[PDB]
Structure formats: C-alpha cells, structure tokens
Design an enzyme around this catalytic site. Structure first.
Site, PDB file in Angstrom:
ATOM      1  N   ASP B  56       0.847  -1.189   0.000  1.00  0.00           N
ATOM      2  CA  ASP B  56       0.000   0.000   0.000  1.00  0.00           C
ATOM      3  C   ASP B  56       0.885   1.242   0.000  1.00  0.00           C
ATOM      4  O   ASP B  56       1.764   1.387   0.855  1.00  0.00           O
ATOM      5  CB  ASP B  56      -0.935  -0.006   1.206  1.00  0.00           C
ATOM      6  CG  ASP B  56      -1.866   1.190   1.226  1.00  0.00           C
ATOM      7  OD1 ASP B  56      -2.740   1.281   0.338  1.00  0.00           O
ATOM      8  OD2 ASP B  56      -1.724   2.042   2.128  1.00  0.00           O
ATOM      9  N   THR B  89      -2.831   6.944  -4.632  1.00  0.00           N
ATOM     10  CA  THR B  89      -1.731   7.695  -4.039  1.00  0.00           C
ATOM     11  C   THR B  89      -0.383   7.283  -4.614  1.00  0.00           C
ATOM     12  O   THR B  89       0.513   8.124  -4.747  1.00  0.00           O
ATOM     13  CB  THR B  89      -1.722   7.513  -2.521  1.00  0.00           C
ATOM     14  OG1 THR B  89      -1.584   6.121  -2.205  1.00  0.00           O
ATOM     15  CG2 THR B  89      -3.011   8.039  -1.918  1.00  0.00           C
ATOM     16  N   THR B  90      -0.222   6.005  -4.961  1.00  0.00           N
ATOM     17  CA  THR B  90       1.017   5.564  -5.592  1.00  0.00           C
ATOM     18  C   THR B  90       1.147   6.133  -6.998  1.00  0.00           C
ATOM     19  O   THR B  90       2.244   6.518  -7.421  1.00  0.00           O
ATOM     20  CB  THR B  90       1.075   4.037  -5.622  1.00  0.00           C
ATOM     21  OG1 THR B  90       1.022   3.528  -4.282  1.00  0.00           O
ATOM     22  CG2 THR B  90       2.359   3.561  -6.283  1.00  0.00           C
ATOM     23  N   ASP B 386      -9.670  -5.521  -2.800  1.00  0.00           N
ATOM     24  CA  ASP B 386      -9.547  -4.808  -4.066  1.00  0.00           C
ATOM     25  C   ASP B 386     -10.717  -5.124  -4.988  1.00  0.00           C
ATOM     26  O   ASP B 386     -11.167  -4.260  -5.749  1.00  0.00           O
ATOM     27  CB  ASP B 386      -8.221  -5.154  -4.740  1.00  0.00           C
ATOM     28  CG  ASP B 386      -7.027  -4.575  -4.010  1.00  0.00           C
ATOM     29  OD1 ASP B 386      -7.222  -3.666  -3.175  1.00  0.00           O
ATOM     30  OD2 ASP B 386      -5.892  -5.028  -4.271  1.00  0.00           O
TER      31      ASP B 386
END
Lengths: 182, 519, 100, 107, 523, 85
Positions: B56, B89-90, B386
C-alpha cells in the site's frame, strides 16, 4: 591473468568513444555557417593560424584518439568525393552517438540501433528525391535575378538590387558550353 | 565578524530547484515498485521493533516521515488524494515526480521556471477535455444484468492468484456482499475474518457481524444460542472472578466480618451481573475476559455471554445492532441495547463463532476466510478487498475508462500531435509532458517481470492504428484490450489524478529560495 | 526499431539549431516555428499551409528559400547523410579496447 | 545439450553430474548468437529446447532476420567435420588442463 | 606584535582599511538583501519556501513576511529594513519598491566611487535629483478616482493592488473587498483598517467566501439563545469549571457519599456565578477557555447567550471594540469592565453557524470579511492580500491621484531627470544620471520574473516614450516581449504610494553612504 | 581439513587464465559479432572481428592460455572453420 597490455570493456569504452567524438564536434560546431567565428590554431613552434573554415581546421587539427581518427578520415572522403559539407557530417555523426549512447543505458542492444539508422537513412533518401527540384528559371521565368540578390544583400553592393544582379545572370548564361557529350 | 546569515542555511537559483527535483525522485523511488496488484512488497520497522509488510502506497508514505521540506509536499498531496478519492496515491506520487525528471535538463539550459508552469497548466486542461470525450457510460448495454458485469470485473482482478481456480465462486460472494449494503457505499463497513483449515469452497458469507470469539473459558452445555429478539449489550466491564481491575481488599480484626468481605467482593460481581439482568439483555459481548463464575449466572438466567471481543468488532457491532458502547453496567438501558432477528453459535471450522442476523440498523456484514494457512488468507483478505473496491466504484460512477495504462497512452499520443501545432517554447515542454505520462504503463511491466521495452514499443504502434482502449495485460504477456477484458476505473478518479499531479509539480517548480530561521 | 529511428529524427535538428545560435538568435523559437511549417505541409497538400520554408540568418526569422535563391546540390545532402550514418555505426561496433 | 541430459539420468555415480555439466556448457554457443542478434539470450534458448524436443534440428537462430526460423530454409548449413572436430579437440584440451597439478620451472 | 592589525583600535571590531574600502562591503551587505526579494516583485514573482521559528512550513511571496522570518543581523542592512517599516506607515504598498530601489542606488554608487568621486558629492547628487522627482511626478498623473463610491469603480482599482500578491483570484477578491470598503466610506475620516476584521475559516475554496457586517466569528453559540439586544457583554478568559477560590480551599474526598456532595457543590458554585451575571443584566458572556456541560444548562436557565472563543487574539479584538476586558477569575460580577453592543444574534452563512456583533442604532465602521480555503498556508496568504487591498483605499481617503503601473512611470520619470542632469554642469551630473538609471531596475526585475529578456524590454520603452506616447508600461506575457497601454488595461498605482516610497528609499541609501565605518562598543 | 600441498591453487589459476581468454573473444562470434580495438605496443590500432587474428596478438605468458592458442590453430588445420567456436 598475465598479459603484456591493458584490456577493458563495458559501457565505459562506448562512453569514451562518444565523449571523444563529441569533443571534435564542439570544436567545429560554432564555426558552421557563413557567420561562424574564427578560431586560432597554435603549433609547437608557437605560430598561429586563424580561419573559419571547418574543413581547414579538421585537416590541421591534431588529436590522438582511436575513434577521433575515424572522423578525421571521414572528412577526407567527403572532401575528395564532393568537397562541401564536411563540417555538417562531423556534427551530425556526433549527435547520432549521443542519442545512441542514451539508448544503450535503456538496455537497447547496439545491433537494433544500427538496423534503425540503415532503415532511416534509406527512407530519408527516398523522401528527399521527391522534394527535389531540377534546373529551371533558364527560360520563361525569372526569380533567378533574386538568386544572386540574396547573396548580394549582405554587402554595400546591394544598394541597387536589380541593376547589378541582372548582369550576373547574363554572365552565367553566356558562358554555357557543352565540351562533353551534352 | 558581522555576518548576515549567522548559520542560516539558504540557497536560491538553479541549484536550489535542481536539489528539489532529486529529492522528489527519492520519494517516488520507494513506492515505485509497489504499483500494480502484482507489485512487490516493502518491510518497514518502527522503534518498537515490529515490521509492517504491505504494498500500500498510502501506508508506506505515512511511516517514512521525511524531514526534507519538498518531500513533505508530495506526502501532503497523497493525504488529499484519500479524502477526494481514496486510492491512486502511488500513481499520483510516481507520476508527479516523473514530470520533474523530463524538464530537468531544460532547466539547466536557462529556461525560466514560469514558462514551465504555463505548460503544465495548459496541457492538463486539454487532458481533462480528452478524458471526458473518451469516457463511455455503460449501464444497460447489451441488456445485461449489472450483477453479471460486476462478477466479470471481479474475476479479472482476482485472476492468476491462489484463488484463480475458485474465483468463479468468490466473485459471487464479493458482488453479493456489496449488494447487501445500503445506497451509501463505504469500504470500512464490510469486515473480513480468517479461519484456518478447510478448502476455499468452505468460505462462508455472513450477512451479520461475526467475530473470532477467542473465549476459551467454561460455561458450556448451557446458554441456549437461539434468540428471536435478544437485547444486545456492549460492555467493556470485566466479569472475571479474580481480576486485575476490580477487587476488594479490606483489613479487619473481626472474624465475623471476614464472611461479609468475601461476600462483598462477590457482591460487587453479583451486582454487575444483576444490572445486566435488570435491563433484560440476552446477549452480552465483553471486551475483557469473563470468569467462569459469571458464566454460570447467565446460564441459569437463560442469557448468553461472550468475552475477549476486540474493540473494532464492538464498534462494528454498535453500528450494526443499533445500540452504543457502555463502559459500566450502571448506565445500561434500552437505549444502548441492540436487536437482531436470528442469533446462532456456529461450529464451522471447529471453533465457536457468533454472528447476528437481520439487525435493523446494520449496514455491515462479515466474510469468512477458509484456507490452508494464515498467509493464504492474509493475502486473499486484501485481494478480495480490491475486488470490493472495483464493484463499489463501478456502482457509484457508471462512466469509466480502460485501465492498465490504456488511457495514459492516448493522452500521450493526442498531446504529442497537438504539441507540434504550437510554435514557441511550449512545443518542447508539452512534448515532454506526454512522455512523462508513459511511466505508468512502463512500471506495470517491470513489476510483473515482463519486458517493458518490447511491450511498450508494440503498444505505442498499436495506438497509431486507432484503438484507444488497448493496454498492458498483467497475467499473460501481450497487448490486450482492457475494455473487453473489463478492467475499468472511474473517469473522475483519473481526472483528479492528473490535477493533483500537475498541481504538485507546479508547486515545486514555483519554489525558488529555501529560507530556514534558526531556532 | 522505433527508438532507433525516432532518435535519428531528433539528431537532424542540430543543423537548424547550430545555425540559429551562430546567428545571434533564440534557437528554441526558430526551430519550433520551423517545425510547425513543415508539419502543416504533411497534413494536407492545400496551399494555405507553408511549404519549403528555411531559415534567414540575417533577419533571424523563417523565410522561403525557393524564392530567396539559397540552394544546395542534391549529392551534397544525400552523401552527407550516408557517410554520417556509416561513421556512427563504425564507432558503435567497437565493444572492446585491447592494448599490447 | 538436450539428449545428454537424458543419458545423464540413465548413468550412475559421479557421471550423473559430470555429464550434465558437460551438457549445460553446450548452451553458451546459442546464447551468444542470440545476444549478437539483438534478442533475449535467456528467452531464446528456452524456446529452442522445446522446438528441438518436439521437432527436429531444423529449429535454430537466424541472425539475418533476427528471429527463430527454419535454418534449412534460410540456406544456413555447415559440414559435419567442423562440429565433430570442435568437440574432440576441445575435450582433449580440457582433460589436459585438469591433469595438471603444478608447474615447475627448470634451468 | 609588529606589524599590528590595520585600522582596528577598538574592541576587536573589524575595520576595513583604505584599500579595503569599507564603503563597498557595506554596500555588498545591502546588495544581497535586495537579491532575495527581487524575484518576488510582480505578479509572476517566484514563491519562497520559508521555515518558521516554530518549524512550520510556510510558502508565501510576500516581502514583508520574509523580512520578519529572515533575521537581518547587519547594521547597515537594517537601515533599509527600518525604512520598510516606515513604508508600511501612511501607505500599505511599496515594500518591494524600497528593497529593490535602495539597492539600485547603492549598486550604482559603487561605480561612481571607483572613479574617485567623493562620497559627499554622491550624497548631494541624490538629494538634488530627488527634489526633481517630486516635481515631475504630479505631471505624470493621468486619471483620478471619480469618488462615486460605486462597487464597479471600487473593485476596478483593487485589480492592481491584489495583483503581485494573489494571482488568479484578482477578479473574485476585487468585488469581495469592495463590498466591505464601500460601507465605511460614507463616514468622513472614520475609515480605518482595524475596523475591517478578517476571519479565515477552513472550507472548500475561495469561491465560497462572502461578506457580512459586524464582527463575524467562526465559533458558534454554545447556548440556545438566538438574538438579544442586551448591550452588557462580559468577556471571561477563565474556562467554566468548579469554582475555586484563590485561598487554600482544600477539598478532601474520602467516601463516595462525600464525592457526590462536592460534585453537586460545583453545580451550586456555577449556579451562583452565572446568577451574578444575570443579576447585573448581562445576557452575553464570552468564554476564552472551555465550557462545562452543566454550565450549558444554567446558560439557558437564565437566558444568557454564551460565546466560546478559543483564540486569544479574538478576545483582544472585543477588548478594543466594545471595551469588555477579560478578567482572570471565574465570572466576576463587574459592570464597569463590560462592553456595549447594540445587536447580538447568531447567524448561518455557508452551512456554518457564525456569531455577529454589530451596532444597529450606532452606525459604526465594523465589518467582517469571511474567507474559505482548503489549505491554511494558501488561505493565510489571502489575508495578506486583503490588508494590502484595504490599505490601498486608506490612502485614497486623502487626495485621489493615480499613476500608471507596470513600470510606466519609472521610464517616464527617468527620461525627464536625465534631461536635467545633462543641462546641469559640474560634478553633480554624475550622481543625477546614476539616479535616473536606478529607475531601470524595476522594469528589469519585472521582466526577468516573467521570463522575458530585460534588454529587449528596456529598448522598446525608450522608443515609444521618445515619440511622446505616455501610459505605456510592460505587458505581462511569457512569449511576448512587447508592451501595451496600461490606461486601457486598468493597471494604475497610487500617487502617494510612489511619493512616500521615493522619499523614504532615498534617505535610506543616503544614510548608509554617510557611515564609513562600523565600530563595536561596550556598555 | 589441512591440505599441506595445495594443487587447487594451480587449478584455479589455470581455469581463471583460460576463461579470461574465452570471455573476450566470445563477443566476436557470428556475423553480427561486435568488433574490437587492438592497440599494438608501438601505438598502431586496428579493427577486426576475426578470432584467429586476435589470439595471435594477445601474447599470453600463462601456460594454460597458450594451450588455447595452440588449440585454435589445430582447428584451422583440420576443418578450417569454427575457430572461435
């Protein structure tokens, strides 16, 4: 290992060859074009030689590198076959190695890079041959008086554009003589 | 002698902007390999000595806490990404730092930073207009029930996994778990529990709230489990006979008073058991352990009690039964009591498990993991999480685009042809803007062990033939259509991704001098 | 073959770049305005788009070289690209340096 | 290299690992030709071992087209004496080196 | 030991010798200060990354904020900084003007001193040319304000002042500040920047901001009282809790029976304290601390409105407005220390309960601009742009005269002074011509921040001003070096803004040239 | 163990010296093989991909490296092809 000399390989050798060819290009780089600046050439005696010609510099330039001597011999082939554009060939040949060295760090094998330049140079000649133009403006049309008018606009002679340039056109047309096989 | 700064560290000009670019690449380097479902994990240990393992990107950035000022800027953008969307965010961190890498050589050539800002503002505005044109809303298309499309999108994300053989069964459970929710969808509502032993087909889908029930103590062969309309009580009180919290110590020289003190210590425990019976609470869920003596009381009173319940399971219960968590037994009343239609203690797995059914206020459910070991379930726990995200986002936003770097390549091709039509310094900058958008499909190939060069080159030539939905396949190595493979992401998520990435990139470029006041 | 051919196109831009610097002009703007004209010629044959536009060293702007009368022979440009290609290949084929 | 692996399984003793090492060293020739041809050395050798298992010697590496194709159709052929003398002469040299314990200088 | 130190006779203070030129190294200190704030001038000015003494990360382009955070330890450099503090007096703009212009005089003064000119002649040269600048400046006035108090005219003037501080919000903040300023203007001479108070609130963005009257606080009303006209207001900084006397007052809690007695005692203590407030007739109580749960019951029992303000500066605003002081004890019944207010009510704007303190009977200049923003760093910078906008019209309360902006007056004034320096013989012509070239620093610093070549802009400005075309400043564009008319674009500066700025920046550079040596002393 | 006499140090020296010869020449295998730059002690340089020519210019003093040079010469006498192989 016991040997009588030094042996080295890897990306450094290709990097040294690109940086060596880039040094020769940067010397004749700013001298390209009619507005190029003059550059001094100093010998071991201490004499100085000044001129803006890139072909003259490469003949009198002395730098010892294995790859640099290849570009120096290259200019001799362009000069003896044609005699113009030797400066542009050295500059382009260096920019090819600068971008090729970047692709090597991208894990692109040199063989795939070589195969690209052979296909690109082949397709370039085909596209140029379509965009060419043959001999014209020798009859029925004059834009040929403006041909020398551009080269005469950089001198004080360019005050009268069509008066002095009209005699240059009649001079080059009157000297036409076959002398061989049409 | 007289110095202006006196130990003050400050620098400006080109070197200050270049130093910030190298600092942003360090932050993107840590989350770089974690992009994608198949991406590699990371291991971070705090001062306590425990190790945190996960891919994450939001969790890793919180644990780093980099002291560099420009690095804190990209970290703060990831926090704003969670409130607006909650994922990506990645992608935002990795993409924003890519723009600085492309314009880095142009800065050293003497290009003014304000011109660079003018490019990222104009190019981003055109990318938003292009996404809205490509985005196609799929609802009643081909007259297919929406449940069928949600299962096919779930099997794709769960393919090439440990459950890839059983993903056909798990796809129905993930879709059904989302359908049991209300009109307001939230990921924190649905809980997931793991149970060792049994095959993957043994996984059960519970509509109510279930917990592990670590309670090992006595009181068996009593406390009937079936309750039609019990009163669910939430109490953190410790009912243990001899406990660390509530005891009674009185020193007297009277022998007759010893019988009362021993009874008074049992009286306090008997009072706490009576206050629960006074309100008529059939189900007793305690966070702290419950002694064997307190279990026999409720056993003869036809009431059930279970202790050692985690606090998170009590908070999910509070939002389920409709009551509230009460610390003591004195304030326990019908206001904090819950209600459920069916309460049953199940022996599935051999352990004793408790769950509710038909709670009027329950927006939450519980899923049960069944596998060979714990590592099979822990990875499947997020793997199914997910899949819930894909089904949840598909219901909220019905206008989506092809994922897997498909939309990133079309924005790269469209802006590459437009950059040639803008004579000026904007040509080289927008041309570098399109190339930076190609880092997302490239990292998917490296994290999957494939060859990034062969895939990206064949993919780029394929977009020249007009297909806008083609992208990288994570399972098989080949160029496949992500639209027909049902890999979808909301259009508003991708728009907010480019907006936050462009805003974070323009802010670092706009920084000129770094001033630090000594103190 | 894409990256090998694509880098060959960027390498040719050094000729208009060098002539712009020696002319005491901005090289980024002239090359940008020069690429915009030749692109519109490839989009459609229609005359409203500029064709065969060169660079003016005196005034530092784009100029049509067909009417201006600044030409170069064909064998000059063709043989310059062939010899420059052979030199970039010959130097690149060397993977090792051995001394005695 | 493919057939010597099967013979290494039928033998016993130290000959199992020694013959297998002799077989795995035969893959350096195709791995080098694939590297100079602009392909993946590791992936190309893997595909050839399958094509030679199901098919015949026809499978190989074509350096002119830069890919795996039929060698006989590409007009690439070599006489048998070159390959036989390559294994015989190289083996006699490797065996001679392994038999040397120490070198001594005389005068 | 011989040879001794050069020129240093006092307290080890470094004394630069003749060849060391103590004057230049003092100019070098003031030169580095200008380079830090030179890139922050103009709408395209680069943002600065500032670390507060509290280790807070602030990003702002304001020059006044940088000088507060960056500590200037050089004595000769403080003279320009102290000139900037006087620049904030009588006008609210021109801070970047002094830092750039005072440095431009010292940079060009170094060129004159190397020629061998005396330092006294350089001083007299600036004071003569400075008087010529004050005479020409009135002739450069083009248009003036119509004094119509119309929002369209009031918001049109804020476009220049809001520019160079908050960019892209120039259109929105123009009408917002205008609505608050047009309310006070009917009062002659009563206009004050302290009367318009700004209160920032975390929210979506700047587009959600609005303008309200009175004093608007973001904290809601703790009580259930809606509106009360009671003028008695008692501000109490002590939080509401169990009343404790300044004496011993030892409370011994032993058994649970006594625990309930002293627990109900605190309810009785808070009962008599709030009762003393209702006895004095004060229905409005302001709390600086927290509020007990039982205090909310007695507040609605006696029908006393309760206001909870956590900020300390919010309490000082009431002390200087209504006049209600904050007493250290818990609700002292003192009528003399209370305030006066005509109207008190609770309002809701933007889905947020806000408390309004205004005067219905008395006119008053009191107004409040409510701001909304996502980031406190960007929202705080908006407050800096409002103060510069409000202070712009504080100058227009005096005579109203406007001068072109964008470096238009700097070229016109430098062209006229150069003419007087050529006709004036003697050695004063050197310092006058350098005084005219000091005006060139502003359009160069404005062009460099926009990514445009400086020498190309300066060449075009002299060409258009030579033909007699005025009102021509610098057009702001990245790819376009050319210029446009400022009068039609709406960019106008303040007459008194330039007047006081040139005078203060002149005396700042003169005082530095008068000091040739810095010597440390001991008390 | 002990191993008072250590013949392995000669074995490891022979393998390392022999492998160093094959590691350089392997890049010249095939029609697409890379070229090399051979600088003679006098300063003269040349470019050739032929493996047999490079081995004659190596001038190897190590005994194990000399037997490989003789091995490449015996291959040209019998078959005449496959020297680098």
């Amino acid at each position: 290992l016991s040997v009588f000399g030094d042996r080295s390989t890897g990306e450094t050798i290709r990097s040294q060859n690109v940086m060596a060819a880039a040094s020769i290009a940067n010397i004749v780089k700013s001298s390209l074009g009619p507005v190029g600046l003059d550059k001094m050439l100093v010998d071991d005696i201490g004499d100085v030689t000044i001129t803006n010609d890139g072909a003259t510099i490469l003949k009198l330039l002395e730098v010892e590198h294995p790859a640099a001597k290849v570009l120096c011999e290259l200019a001799d082939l362009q000069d003896k076959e044609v005699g113009d554009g030797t400066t542009s060939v050295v500059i382009i040949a260096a920019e090819l190695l600068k971008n090729a060295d970047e692709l090597v760090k991208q894990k692109i094998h040199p063989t795939s890079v070589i195969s690209g330049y052979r296909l690109a140079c082949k397709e370039a000649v085909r596209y140029i041959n379509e965009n060419l133009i043959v001999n014209t403006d020798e009859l029925g049309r004059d834009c040929l008086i403006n041909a020398a008018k551009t080269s005469m606009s950089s001198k004080i002679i360019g005050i009268n554009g069509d008066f002095f340039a009209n005699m240059v056109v009649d001079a080059v047309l009157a000297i036409k003589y076959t002398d061989i096989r049409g | 002698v007289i110095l202006l700064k006196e130990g003050t560290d400050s620098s400006q000009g080109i070197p200050q902007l270049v130093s910030n670019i190298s600092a942003c690449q360090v932050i993107a380097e840590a989350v770089r390999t974690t992009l994608g479902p198949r991406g590699m994990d990371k291991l971070i240990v705090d001062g306590r000595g425990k190790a945190t393992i996960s891919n994450d990107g939001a969790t890793i950035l919180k644990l780093l806490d980099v002291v560099h000022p420009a690095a804190k800027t990209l970290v703060d953008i990831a926090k704003s990404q969670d409130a607006e969307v909650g994922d990506g965010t990645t992608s935002v961190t990795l993409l924003a730092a890519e723009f600085l890498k492309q314009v880095k050589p142009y800065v050293e050539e003497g290009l003014h930073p304000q011109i660079i800002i003018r490019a990222f503002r104009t190019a981003t505005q055109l990318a938003v207009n292009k996404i809205k044109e490509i985005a196609v809303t799929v609802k009643k298309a081909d007259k297919v029930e929406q449940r069928k499309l949600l299962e096919k999108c779930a099997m794709t994300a769960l393919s090439s996994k440990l459950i890839s053989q059983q993903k056909a069964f798990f796809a129905k459970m993930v879709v059904d778990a989302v359908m049991m929710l209300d009109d307001l969808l939230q990921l924190k509502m649905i809980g997931i529990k793991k149970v060792q032993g049994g095959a993957l087909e043994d996984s059960q889908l519970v509509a109510g709230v279930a917990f592990k029930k670590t309670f090992s103590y006595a009181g068996f062969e009593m406390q009937p489990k079936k309750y039609h309309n019990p009163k669910i009580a939430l109490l953190n009180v410790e009912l243990e006979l001899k406990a660390e919290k509530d005891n009674a110590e009185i020193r007297v020289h009277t022998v007759e008073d010893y019988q009362a003190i021993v009874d008074a210590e049992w009286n306090i425990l008997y009072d706490k058991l009576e206050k629960i019976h006074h309100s008529g609470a059939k189900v007793v869920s305690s966070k702290l352990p419950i002694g064997d003596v307190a279990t026999q009381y409720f056993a003869d009173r036809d009431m059930f009690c279970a202790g050692r319940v985690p606090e998170e399971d009590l908070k999910r219960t509070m939002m389920a039964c409709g009551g509230s968590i009460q610390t003591s037994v004195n304030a326990l009343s019908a206001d904090v009591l819950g209600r459920c239609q069916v309460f049953e203690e199940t022996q599935i797995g051999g352990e004793r498990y408790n769950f509710f059914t038909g709670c009027p206020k329950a927006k939450t459910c519980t899923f049960i993991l069944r596998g060979g070991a714990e590592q099979f379930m822990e990875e499947t726990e997020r793997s199914l999480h997910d899949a819930i995200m894909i089904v949840r986002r598909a219901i909220k936003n019905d206008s989506v685009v092809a994922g897997g770097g498909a939309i990133e390549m079309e924005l790269s091709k469209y802006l590459r042809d437009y950059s040639r039509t803008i004579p000026g310094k904007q040509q080289l900058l927008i041309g570098a803007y399109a190339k930076a958008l190609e880092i997302i499909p490239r990292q998917l190939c490296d994290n999957a062990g494939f060859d990034a060069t062969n895939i990206l080159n064949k993919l780029r030539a394929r977009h020249a033939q007009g297909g806008t939905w083609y992208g990288v396949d994570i399972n098989n190595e080949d160029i496949a259509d992500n639209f027909e493979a049902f890999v979808w992401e909301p259009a508003m998520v991708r728009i907010n991704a480019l907006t936050a990435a462009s805003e974070a990139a323009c802010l670092i470029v706009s920084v000129d001098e770094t001033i630090k006041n000594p103190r | 073959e894409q990256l090998a051919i694509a880098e060959f196109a960027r390498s040719l831009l050094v000729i208009p770049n060098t002539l712009a610097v020696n002319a005491a002009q901005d090289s980024t703007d002239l090359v940008a305005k020069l690429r915009a004209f030749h692109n519109e010629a490839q989009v459609n044959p229609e005359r409203k788009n500029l064709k065969w536009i060169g660079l003016d060293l005196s005034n530092g702007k784009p100029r049509d070289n067909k009417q201006a009368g600044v030409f170069e022979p064909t064998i000059v440009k063709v043989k310059s690209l062939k010899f420059a290609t052979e030199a970039a290949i010959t130097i690149l084929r060397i993977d090792d340096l051995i001394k005695l | 290299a493919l057939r010597l692996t099967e013979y290494s399984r039928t033998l016993s003793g130290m000959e199992s690992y020694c013959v297998r090492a002799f077989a795995d060293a035969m893959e350096v020739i195709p791995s080098t030709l694939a590297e100079n041809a602009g392909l993946n050395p590791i992936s190309t050798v893997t595909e050839l071992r399958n094509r030679h298992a199901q098919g015949e010697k026809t499978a190989g590496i074509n350096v002119r087209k830069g890919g795996i194709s039929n060698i006989l159709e590409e007009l690439v052929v070599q006489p048998l004496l070159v390959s036989v003398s390559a294994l015989t002469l190289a083996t006699e040299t490797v065996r001679s080196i392994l038999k040397i314990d120490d070198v001594v200088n005389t005068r | 030991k011989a040879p001794g130190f050069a020129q240093m006779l006092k307290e080890g203070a470094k004394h630069f010798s003749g060849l060391e030129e103590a004057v230049y190294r003092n100019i070098q200190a003031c030169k580095e200060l200008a380079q830090t704030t030179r890139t922050a001038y103009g709408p395209n000015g680069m943002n600065k990354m500032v670390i507060n003494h509290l280790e807070k990360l602030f990003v702002t382009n304001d020059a006044a904020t940088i000088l507060r955070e960056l500590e200037v330890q050089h004595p000769a450099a403080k003279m320009i900084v102290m000139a900037s503090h006087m620049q904030e007096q009588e006008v609210g703009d021109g801070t970047n003007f002094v830092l750039v212009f005072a440095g431009a005089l010292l940079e060009l003064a170094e060129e004159l001193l190397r020629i061998g000119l005396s330092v006294s002649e350089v001083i007299e040269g600036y004071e003569i040319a400075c008087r010529k600048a004050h005479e020409i400046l009135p002739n450069l006035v083009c248009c003036s304000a119509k004094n119509l108090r119309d929002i369209d005219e009031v918001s049109s003037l804020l476009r220049t002042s809001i520019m160079s501080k908050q960019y892209g919000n120039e259109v929105f903040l123009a009408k917002l500040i205008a609505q608050a300023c047009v309310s006070i203007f009917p009062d002659s001479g009563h206009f004050n920047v302290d009367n318009i108070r700004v209160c920032k609130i975390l929210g979506s963005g700047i587009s959600s901001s609005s303008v309200l009257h009175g004093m608007v606080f973001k904290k809601e009303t703790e009580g259930d009282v809606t509106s009360v006209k009671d003028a008695k207001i008692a501000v109490y900084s002590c939080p509401f809790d169990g009343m404790i006397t300044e004496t011993k007052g030892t409370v011994l809690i032993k058994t649970a029976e006594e625990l309930m007695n002293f627990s109900k005692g605190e309810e009785n203590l808070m009962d008599a304290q709030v009762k003393a407030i209702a006895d004095t007739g004060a229905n409005v109580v302001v709390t600086g601390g927290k509020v007990a749960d039982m205090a909310l019951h007695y507040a609605n029992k006696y029908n006393i409105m309760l206001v909870r303000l956590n900020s300390k500066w919010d309490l000082r605003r009431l002390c200087k407005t209504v006049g209600a002081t904050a007493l250290p004890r818990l609700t002292p019944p003192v009528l003399e220390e209370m305030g006066h207010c005509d109207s008190v009510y609770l309002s809701e704007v933007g889905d947020t309960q806000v408390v309004v303190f205004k005067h219905e009977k008395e006119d008053g200049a009191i107004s409040t601009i409510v701001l909304r923003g996502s980031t406190d760093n960007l929202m705080d910078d908006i407050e800096r742009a409002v103060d510069d906008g409000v202070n712009t019209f504080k100058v227009l309360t005096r005579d109203k005269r406007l001068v072109p902006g964008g470096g238009a007056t700097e070229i016109e004034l430098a062209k006229q002074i150069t003419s007087y320096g050529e006709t004036c013989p003697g050695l004063e012509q050197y310092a006058i011509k350098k005084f005219a070239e000091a005006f060139e620093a502003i359009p160069r610093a404005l062009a460099e921040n926009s990514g445009v070549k400086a020498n190309e802009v300066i060449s075009k400005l002299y060409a258009v001003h030579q033909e007699g075309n005025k009102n021509v400043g610098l057009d702001i564009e990245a790819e376009v070096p050319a210029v446009k008319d400022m009068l039609e674009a709406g960019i106008l500066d303040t007459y008194l803004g330039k007047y006081w700025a040139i005078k203060l920046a002149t005396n700042a550079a003169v005082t530095v040239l008068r000091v040739d040596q810095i010597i440390m002393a001991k008390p | 163990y002990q191993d008072r006499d250590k013949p392995a140090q000669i074995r490891f020296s022979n393998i390392s010296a022999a492998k160093a010869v094959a590691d350089a020449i392997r890049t010249s295998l095939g029609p697409k093989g890379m070229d090399k730059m051979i600088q003679d002690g006098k300063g003269d340089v040349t470019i050739t991909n032929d493996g047999a020519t490079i081995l004659k210019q190596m001038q190897v003093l190590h005994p194990a490296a000399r037997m490989l040079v003789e091995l490449s010469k015996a291959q040209d006498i019998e078959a005449g092809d496959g020297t680098t192989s």
